[PDB]
Design an enzyme around this catalytic site. Structure first.
Site, PDB file in Angstrom:
ATOM      1  N   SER B  64       0.795  -1.243   0.000  1.00 33.39           N
ATOM      2  CA  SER B  64       0.000   0.000   0.000  1.00 33.39           C
ATOM      3  C   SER B  64       0.830   1.296   0.000  1.00 33.39           C
ATOM      4  CB  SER B  64      -0.956   0.019   1.195  1.00 33.39           C
ATOM      5  OG  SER B  64      -1.683  -1.191   1.317  1.00 33.39           O
ATOM      6  N   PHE B  66       2.943   1.967  -2.197  1.00 33.60           N
ATOM      7  CA  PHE B  66       3.022   2.300  -3.619  1.00 33.60           C
ATOM      8  C   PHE B  66       1.736   2.914  -4.192  1.00 33.60           C
ATOM      9  CE2 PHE B  66       6.469  -0.696  -2.731  1.00 33.60           C
ATOM     10  CZ  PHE B  66       7.548   0.051  -3.229  1.00 33.60           C
ATOM     11  N   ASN B  94       7.184 -12.784 -25.234  1.00 38.65           N
ATOM     12  CA  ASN B  94       7.112 -12.093 -23.948  1.00 38.65           C
ATOM     13  C   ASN B  94       7.968 -12.785 -22.867  1.00 38.65           C
ATOM     14  OD1 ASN B  94       5.498 -14.276 -22.932  1.00 38.65           O
ATOM     15  ND2 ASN B  94       3.621 -13.154 -22.923  1.00 38.65           N
ATOM     16  N   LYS B  99       9.700 -17.715 -18.093  1.00 46.11           N
ATOM     17  CA  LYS B  99       9.285 -18.420 -16.866  1.00 46.11           C
ATOM     18  C   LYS B  99       9.141 -19.914 -17.106  1.00 46.11           C
ATOM     19  CE  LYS B  99       6.045 -14.667 -15.496  1.00 46.11           C
ATOM     20  NZ  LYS B  99       4.684 -14.569 -14.924  1.00 46.11           N
ATOM     21  N   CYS B 137      -5.830 -19.984 -20.075  1.00 46.45           N
ATOM     22  CA  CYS B 137      -5.758 -18.585 -19.648  1.00 46.45           C
ATOM     23  C   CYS B 137      -4.437 -17.909 -20.075  1.00 46.45           C
ATOM     24  CB  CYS B 137      -6.046 -18.496 -18.142  1.00 46.45           C
ATOM     25  SG  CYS B 137      -7.575 -19.374 -17.716  1.00 46.45           S
ATOM     26  N   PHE B 143       4.235 -18.834 -22.996  1.00 43.30           N
ATOM     27  CA  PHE B 143       4.647 -20.124 -22.388  1.00 43.30           C
ATOM     28  C   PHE B 143       4.635 -21.184 -23.491  1.00 43.30           C
ATOM     29  CE2 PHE B 143       3.415 -20.839 -17.649  1.00 43.30           C
ATOM     30  CZ  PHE B 143       3.995 -19.654 -17.264  1.00 43.30           C
ATOM     31  N   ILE B 196     -12.818 -19.396 -19.144  1.00 42.13           N
ATOM     32  CA  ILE B 196     -12.442 -20.602 -18.345  1.00 42.13           C
ATOM     33  C   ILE B 196     -13.427 -20.767 -17.181  1.00 42.13           C
ATOM     34  CG2 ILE B 196     -10.861 -20.522 -16.370  1.00 42.13           C
ATOM     35  CD1 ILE B 196      -9.769 -22.761 -17.452  1.00 42.13           C
ATOM     36  N   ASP B 224      -1.665 -19.899 -16.833  1.00 47.93           N
ATOM     37  CA  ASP B 224      -1.081 -18.592 -16.463  1.00 47.93           C
ATOM     38  C   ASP B 224      -2.162 -17.511 -16.279  1.00 47.93           C
ATOM     39  OD1 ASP B 224       1.453 -17.317 -15.617  1.00 47.93           O
ATOM     40  OD2 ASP B 224       1.325 -16.090 -17.375  1.00 47.93           O
ATOM     41  N   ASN B 234      -4.084  -5.732  -3.088  1.00 48.31           N
ATOM     42  CA  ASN B 234      -4.183  -6.517  -1.853  1.00 48.31           C
ATOM     43  C   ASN B 234      -5.315  -7.564  -1.886  1.00 48.31           C
ATOM     44  OD1 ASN B 234      -1.965  -5.132  -0.792  1.00 48.31           O
ATOM     45  ND2 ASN B 234      -3.126  -3.742   0.446  1.00 48.31           N
ATOM     46  N   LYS B 264      -0.119 -20.664 -12.322  1.00 49.93           N
ATOM     47  CA  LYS B 264       0.107 -19.406 -11.613  1.00 49.93           C
ATOM     48  C   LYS B 264      -0.943 -19.234 -10.520  1.00 49.93           C
ATOM     49  CE  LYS B 264      -0.629 -15.529 -13.797  1.00 49.93           C
ATOM     50  NZ  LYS B 264      -0.192 -14.962 -15.090  1.00 49.93           N
ATOM     51  N   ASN B 299       6.255  -9.045  -6.284  1.00 48.83           N
ATOM     52  CA  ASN B 299       4.851  -9.412  -6.510  1.00 48.83           C
ATOM     53  C   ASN B 299       4.498 -10.769  -5.883  1.00 48.83           C
ATOM     54  OD1 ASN B 299       5.650 -11.303  -8.597  1.00 48.83           O
ATOM     55  ND2 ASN B 299       4.395 -10.438 -10.131  1.00 48.83           N
TER      56      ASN B 299
HETATM   57  P1  LIG Z   1       1.670  -8.578 -10.881  1.00 52.58           P
HETATM   58  O1  LIG Z   1       0.738  -7.602 -11.478  1.00 52.58           O
HETATM   59  O2  LIG Z   1       0.881  -9.501  -9.848  1.00 52.58           O
HETATM   60  O3  LIG Z   1       2.827  -7.794 -10.131  1.00 52.58           O
HETATM   61  P2  LIG Z   1       3.968  -7.154 -10.960  1.00 52.58           P
HETATM   62  O4  LIG Z   1       4.983  -8.179 -11.270  1.00 52.58           O
HETATM   63  O5  LIG Z   1       3.399  -6.615 -12.209  1.00 52.58           O
HETATM   64  O6  LIG Z   1       4.690  -5.994 -10.130  1.00 52.58           O
HETATM   65  P3  LIG Z   1       3.875  -4.724  -9.677  1.00 52.58           P
HETATM   66  O7  LIG Z   1       2.461  -4.902 -10.037  1.00 52.58           O
HETATM   67  O8  LIG Z   1       4.397  -3.477 -10.377  1.00 52.58           O
HETATM   68  O9  LIG Z   1       4.028  -4.552  -8.084  1.00 52.58           O
HETATM   69  C1  LIG Z   1       4.269  -5.671  -7.304  1.00 52.58           C
HETATM   70  C2  LIG Z   1       3.336  -6.008  -6.278  1.00 52.58           C
HETATM   71  O10 LIG Z   1       2.763  -4.801  -5.698  1.00 52.58           O
HETATM   72  C3  LIG Z   1       1.408  -4.776  -6.027  1.00 52.58           C
HETATM   73  N1  LIG Z   1       1.014  -3.431  -6.420  1.00 52.58           N
HETATM   74  C4  LIG Z   1       1.225  -2.837  -7.601  1.00 52.58           C
HETATM   75  N2  LIG Z   1       0.706  -1.578  -7.575  1.00 52.58           N
HETATM   76  C5  LIG Z   1       0.745  -0.637  -8.691  1.00 52.58           C
HETATM   77  C6  LIG Z   1       0.160  -1.370  -6.354  1.00 52.58           C
HETATM   78  C7  LIG Z   1       0.362  -2.557  -5.619  1.00 52.58           C
HETATM   79  N3  LIG Z   1      -0.081  -2.664  -4.338  1.00 52.58           N
HETATM   80  C8  LIG Z   1      -0.716  -1.631  -3.759  1.00 52.58           C
HETATM   81  N4  LIG Z   1      -1.191  -1.765  -2.373  1.00 52.58           N
HETATM   82  N5  LIG Z   1      -0.927  -0.475  -4.422  1.00 52.58           N
HETATM   83  C9  LIG Z   1      -0.510  -0.307  -5.708  1.00 52.58           C
HETATM   84  O11 LIG Z   1      -0.766   0.921  -6.347  1.00 52.58           O
HETATM   85  C10 LIG Z   1       1.240  -5.737  -7.145  1.00 52.58           C
HETATM   86  O12 LIG Z   1      -0.059  -6.259  -7.175  1.00 52.58           O
HETATM   87  C11 LIG Z   1       2.219  -6.768  -6.843  1.00 52.58           C
HETATM   88  O13 LIG Z   1       1.736  -7.677  -5.882  1.00 52.58           O
HETATM   89  C1  LIG Z   2      -0.918 -12.499 -18.515  1.00 54.26           C
HETATM   90  S1  LIG Z   2      -1.574 -13.943 -19.155  1.00 54.26           S
HETATM   91  C2  LIG Z   2      -0.326 -15.254 -19.001  1.00 54.26           C
HETATM   92  C3  LIG Z   2       0.744 -15.295 -20.048  1.00 54.26           C
HETATM   93  C4  LIG Z   2       0.844 -16.527 -20.875  1.00 54.26           C
HETATM   94  N1  LIG Z   2       1.117 -17.672 -20.009  1.00 54.26           N
HETATM   95  C5  LIG Z   2       1.922 -16.362 -21.875  1.00 54.26           C
HETATM   96  O1  LIG Z   2       3.019 -17.015 -21.734  1.00 54.26           O
HETATM   97  O2  LIG Z   2       1.774 -15.614 -22.830  1.00 54.26           O
HETATM   98  C6  LIG Z   2      -3.036 -14.348 -18.260  1.00 54.26           C
HETATM   99  C7  LIG Z   2      -4.210 -14.683 -19.129  1.00 54.26           C
HETATM  100  O3  LIG Z   2      -5.281 -15.205 -18.353  1.00 54.26           O
HETATM  101  C8  LIG Z   2      -6.402 -14.889 -19.142  1.00 54.26           C
HETATM  102  N2  LIG Z   2      -7.580 -15.017 -18.434  1.00 54.26           N
HETATM  103  C9  LIG Z   2      -7.971 -14.301 -17.345  1.00 54.26           C
HETATM  104  N3  LIG Z   2      -9.188 -14.726 -16.978  1.00 54.26           N
HETATM  105  C10 LIG Z   2      -9.583 -15.705 -17.817  1.00 54.26           C
HETATM  106  C11 LIG Z   2     -10.740 -16.513 -17.929  1.00 54.26           C
HETATM  107  N4  LIG Z   2     -11.846 -16.355 -16.983  1.00 54.26           N
HETATM  108  N5  LIG Z   2     -10.804 -17.409 -18.916  1.00 54.26           N
HETATM  109  C12 LIG Z   2      -9.785 -17.560 -19.808  1.00 54.26           C
HETATM  110  N6  LIG Z   2      -8.667 -16.811 -19.731  1.00 54.26           N
HETATM  111  C13 LIG Z   2      -8.546 -15.886 -18.754  1.00 54.26           C
HETATM  112  C14 LIG Z   2      -6.167 -13.517 -19.494  1.00 54.26           C
HETATM  113  O4  LIG Z   2      -6.914 -13.137 -20.585  1.00 54.26           O
HETATM  114  C15 LIG Z   2      -4.721 -13.510 -19.787  1.00 54.26           C
HETATM  115  O5  LIG Z   2      -4.497 -13.614 -21.159  1.00 54.26           O
END
Ligand SMILES: *P(=O)(O)OP(=O)(O)OP(=O)(O)OC[C@H]1O[C@@H](N2CN(C)c3c2nc(N)[nH]c3=O)[C@H](O)[C@@H]1O
Ligand SMILES: C[S@@+](CC[C@H](N)C(=O)[O-])C[C@H]1O[C@@H](n2cnc3c(N)ncnc32)[C@H](O)[C@@H]1O
Lengths: 171, 695
Positions: B64, B66, B94, B99, B137, B143, B196, B224, B234, B264, B299
């Site tokens: 929070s 951030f 990507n 991963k 997803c 991937f 899904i 994913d 949060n 994931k 994250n």
């Molecule tokens: P991903 O979206 O789950 O997490 P990512 O790898 O992209 O990193 P990032 O979003 O930039 O930040 C990491 C973790 O912090 C949380 N964030 C992002 N964000 C903009 C934000 C977060 N938390 C709070 N309380 N407020 C904010 O403005 C992300 O969800 C990740 O957990």
């Molecule tokens: C960020 S991506 C993962 C990346 C992917 N593994 C790759 O390597 O390109 C997550 C995906 O989950 C999909 N998704 C989210 N909710 C979904 C749902 N209810 N049904 C199907 N796909 C979903 C999103 O559209 C998104 O494309």
RNA sequence: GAUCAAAAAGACAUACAUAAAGACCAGGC
């Protein structure tokens, strides 16, 4: 319809072509210039059958090119309204099937299709199948059409057909 | 928070697993009361059942901090603070592909080279078997690109993702043959939404996947799933709970026995999410919670990784299917499903619980240090990770990933690419015409057992695939140009086939519908794998798998690819039983000879190819004493019951040595044909000759 | 969770088409 007629041409030869192979060049120049072309007067020139006579070359004044009048026999395709010809529907477009009559394209308006031939988009390959099915009317089928009208736009001719009369359609 | 007391960044990753689940798999009677419906809770601060309260509050507070920061300022500090950020996507579409590259190294290649419980590979690249996988997803399938690139065509992928901006970008698979992948969007197939969470998409995909895997399922599923939770970061666990459940339910729906799963997830504080992990721990031989270094350190993103799907998981699948129906009924209500396993059952497994707590608290501790590190790198812009370029080079070396840029394939012309794929083989080999089968050439089919036969429906052509719809054909003459194939079909790059084009008539007469199809006669190269030196049936075994790999059954608008039905020459009698006289559209009502395939489709045959599959000096005999075929070497006089490696006819011998028995006018091959030409071989002449020379 | 572009040498974008016509007047060879 296919015809065998006698046609004429003036071959303008660039000065480089002169020299030894001169008469031969005229024949080769002729074949390249008329074959594949189309006109409103005679239509599509399918191919040159024979070269009857080669006229004496006359130097054109003020330009390098020298013009050789040429008489030749050719095969032409000239459609007419009311004539029935066998066509294949290359494209089963919803607005109308696109049918290529030999080298000439022909469009059959959907409005000229009997009401029993509903269009069916959901079918695997699209088709105006008869409502029960009966006749798919799709790609690669042989159909009989009546040419209702012709047009010539940029040396290329196209026609419009109809399926309203009896004994037309799927073959 | 002292973030400077972090261990030195490394390419070496450690895996801790759950213990092995010693309990039985829960049945429908045990699970009958496990689904607790309560008030919809949108509070994460009190989810302390599987993590210490001080660590949960500390990680939530560190997130929070951030919420008041500019997202581009945060992103720039994070890019300097993460030791692993320079890895990115390398040459893949990507960073998600990297991963899967990272985790497939860390997990002993179990995804790209899965094993039985005896450690033997379940898929051998030289045998007729494909690596089936699924990716859910997963748009835009980064991937998938790594898996397809790693296994080339020896793999077949099935995809389901939401339609929209995040759909599969199959066009962007620069490193992999996208033709080996098949997106399917649930109910309606290609025309579905790909939801899904929706059960019907799961069901249609489920039936489709089982059908496209010999009713066994995939070797592994990847998942994913995630969506934007911008300004509610949060609550990401609670918001994604139904998507987590539907990905786990999908694993139990389409993964084979002994197969693997990777999904994931985010935080795992709620008893709902922990109960879902408990059900996977019951259903698989081994489970772990793992955060790869290619995941960003700050994250909540981690992966559940499951190895060896057990037998008898049907009740847990059908339970989770009922829970998903209940979640869908409770959408937009003040009620929700809050438990899927009772807390007393989960906490009754102390070994599971002790791992779950330790996994959460270790992740929180690392995430708190990583969040505090990003905050320090926002406050001081001179801070940098000096080792990012070193760590990148070591990770790429370790995972066996080449250090090269993403380059759009190169566009090769089909002639230059043909010369590359033939690797200096003489071009004249591709110009050889078949020997016509006539009463003067009939003796060439001796010995009969050396030969195979197939029914032809057009002239033979070569076909080259440059990727997607860049398919070209050539008629084998050095003077002929490569012609672009005017069919709605897709093939992987680096594919070289011997084919014909066959129109498959459906029905008869006016109702008759004919569809052209690609018919593979033989294969040379399959997505950069050369197969030309393999035995004709063995090459065909690889060819048969390839047709399924490039298949698209959700796309009935596409032109089909098929392998020809190959007969043994001593069984040519089975071909004539499939010859029928059918009324073809446009034949003026005259029936035409038609060969009927494995489906309700037929084509007009032109004749029969006879292909030699045994190389000189070898030939196949039949032993009357042993009732088995044997190979005989005409030079050494040796005999064996096993296949000699030098007896194998490669593509060039099969192609050069081929005969063609044309079936034109005057040839009797079906009893309704009259009159016969006496100078032309009938079915009866060829069958009599074959019968005399079987013995 | 994945991803996160800068305005491409402008050519009277070209005929310089201001060059009314019409008229008378003056001069040149
Ligand atoms: P991903 O979206 O789950 O997490 P990512 O790898 O992209 O990193 P990032 O979003 O930039 O930040 C990491 C973790 O912090 C949380 N964030 C992002 N964000 C903009 C934000 C977060 N938390 C709070 N309380 N407020 C904010 O403005 C992300 O969800 C990740 O957990
Ligand atoms: C960020 S991506 C993962 C990346 C992917 N593994 C790759 O390597 O390109 C997550 C995906 O989950 C999909 N998704 C989210 N909710 C979904 C749902 N209810 N049904 C199907 N796909 C979903 C999103 O559209 C998104 O494309």
């Amino acid at each position: 319809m296919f015809y065998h007629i006698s046609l004429e041409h003036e071959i303008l030869l660039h000065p480089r072509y002169f020299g030894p192979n001169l008469l031969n060049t005229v024949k080769q120049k002729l074949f390249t210039e008329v074959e594949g072309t189309c006109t409103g007067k005679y239509g599509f020139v399918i191919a040159v059958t024979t070269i009857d006579n080669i006229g004496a070359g006359v130097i054109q004044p003020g330009r390098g090119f020298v013009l050789y009048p040429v008489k030749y026999k050719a095969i032409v395709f000239r459609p007419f309204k009311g004539e029935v010809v066998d066509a294949v529907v290359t494209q089963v477009n919803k607005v109308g099937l696109f049918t290529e009559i030999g080298p000439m394209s022909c469009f059959i308006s959907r409005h000229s299709i009997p009401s029993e031939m509903e269009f069916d988009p959901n079918s695997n390959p699209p088709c105006y199948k008869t409502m029960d099915e009966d006749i798919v009317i799709q790609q690669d089928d042989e159909i009989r059409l009546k040419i209702v009208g012709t047009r010539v736009d940029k040396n290329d001719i196209f026609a419009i057909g109809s399926l309203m009369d009896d004994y037309l359609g799927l073959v | 928070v002292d973030w400077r007391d972090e261990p030195e960044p490394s390419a070496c990753e450690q895996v801790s697993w759950f213990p092995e689940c010693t309990t039985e798999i829960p049945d429908t009677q045990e699970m009958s009361d496990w689904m607790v419906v309560g008030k919809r809770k949108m509070i994460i601060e009190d989810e302390t059942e599987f993590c210490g309260e001080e660590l949960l509050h500390s990680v939530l507070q560190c997130k929070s901090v951030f919420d008041v920061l500019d997202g581009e300022e945060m992103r720039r500090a994070r890019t300097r603070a993460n030791p692993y950020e320079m890895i990115r996507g390398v040459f893949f579409l990507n960073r998600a592909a990297m991963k899967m590259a990272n985790m497939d190294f860390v997990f002993d290649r179990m995804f790209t080279n899965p094993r039985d419980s005896y450690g033997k590979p379940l898929v051998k690249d030289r045998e007729a078997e494909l690596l089936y996988f699924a990716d859910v997803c997963a748009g835009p399938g980064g991937f998938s690109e790594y898996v397809l690139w790693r296994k080339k065509w020896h793999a077949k992928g099935f995809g389901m993702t939401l339609k929209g901006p995040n759909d599969f970008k199959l066009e962007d698979f620069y490193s992999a043959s996208s033709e080996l992948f098949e997106p399917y969007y649930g109910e309606g197939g290609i025309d579905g939404d790909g939801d899904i969470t929706r059960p019907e998409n799961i069901s249609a995909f489920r039936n489709f996947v089982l059908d496209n895997t010999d009713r066994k399922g995939v070797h592994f599923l990847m998942a994913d799933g995630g969506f934007s939770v911008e300004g509610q970061e949060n609550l990401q666990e609670i918001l994604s709970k139904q998507l987590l459940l539907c990905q786990f339910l999908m694993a139990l729906s389409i993964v084979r026995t002994g197969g693997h799963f990777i999904c994931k997830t985010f935080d795992l504080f709620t008893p709902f999410s922990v109960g879902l992990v408990y059900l996977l721990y019951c259903c698989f031989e081994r489970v772990c919670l793992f955060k790869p270094i290619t995941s960003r350190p700050a994250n909540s993103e981690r992966y559940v990784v499951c190895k060896g799907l057990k037998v008898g998981i049907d009740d847990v699948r059908d339970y989770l299917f009922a829970v998903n129906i209940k979640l869908n009924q409770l959408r937009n209500t003040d009620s929700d499903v809050n438990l899927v396993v009772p807390l007393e059952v989960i906490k009754g497994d102390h070994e599971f619980t002790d791992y779950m707590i330790r996994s959460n608290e270790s992740h929180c501790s690392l995430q708190i240090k990583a969040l505090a590190k990003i905050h320090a790198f926002v406050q001081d812009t001179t801070l940098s990770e000096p080792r990012q370029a070193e760590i990148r080079k070591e990770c790429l070396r370790l995972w066996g990933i080449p250090d090269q840029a993403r380059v759009a394939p190169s566009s090769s012309d089909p002639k230059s690419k043909f010369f590359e794929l033939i690797q200096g083989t003489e071009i004249d080999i591709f110009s050889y015409k078949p020997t016509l089968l006539t009463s003067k050439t009939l003796e060439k089919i001796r010995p009969v057992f050396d030969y195979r036969c197939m029914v032809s429906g057009s002239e033979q052509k070569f076909l080259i695939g440059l990727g997607k719809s860049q398919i070209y054909t050539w008629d084998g003459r050095q003077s002929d140009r490569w012609i672009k194939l005017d069919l709605k079909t897709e093939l992987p790059r680096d594919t070289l086939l011997s084919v014909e084009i066959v129109h498959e008539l459906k029905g008869e007469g006016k109702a008759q519908r004919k569809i052209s199809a690609i018919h593979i006669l033989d294969v040379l190269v399959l997505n950069g794998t050369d197969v030309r030196e393999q035995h004709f049936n063995q090459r065909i075994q690889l060819a048969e798998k390839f047709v399924k790999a490039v298949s698209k059954p959700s796309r009935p608008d596409m032109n089909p690819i098929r392998v020809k039905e190959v007969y043994r020459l001593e069984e040519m009698e089975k071909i004539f039983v499939r010859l029928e006289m059918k009324i073809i559209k446009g034949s003026s009502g005259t029936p035409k000879l038609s060969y009927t395939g494995r489906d309700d489709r037929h084509f007009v045959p032109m004749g029969l190819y006879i292909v030699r599959t045994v190389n000189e000096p070898w030939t196949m005999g039949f032993s009357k004493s042993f009732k088995k075929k044997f190979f005989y070497n005409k030079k050494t006089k040796d005999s064996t019951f096993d296949l000699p490696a030098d007896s194998i006819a490669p593509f060039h011998i099969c192609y050069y040595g081929r005969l063609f028995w044309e079936w034109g006018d005057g040839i009797r091959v079906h009893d309704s044909q009259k009159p016969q030409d006496q100078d032309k071989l009938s079915k009866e002449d060829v069958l009599s000759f074959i019968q005399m020379h079987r013995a």
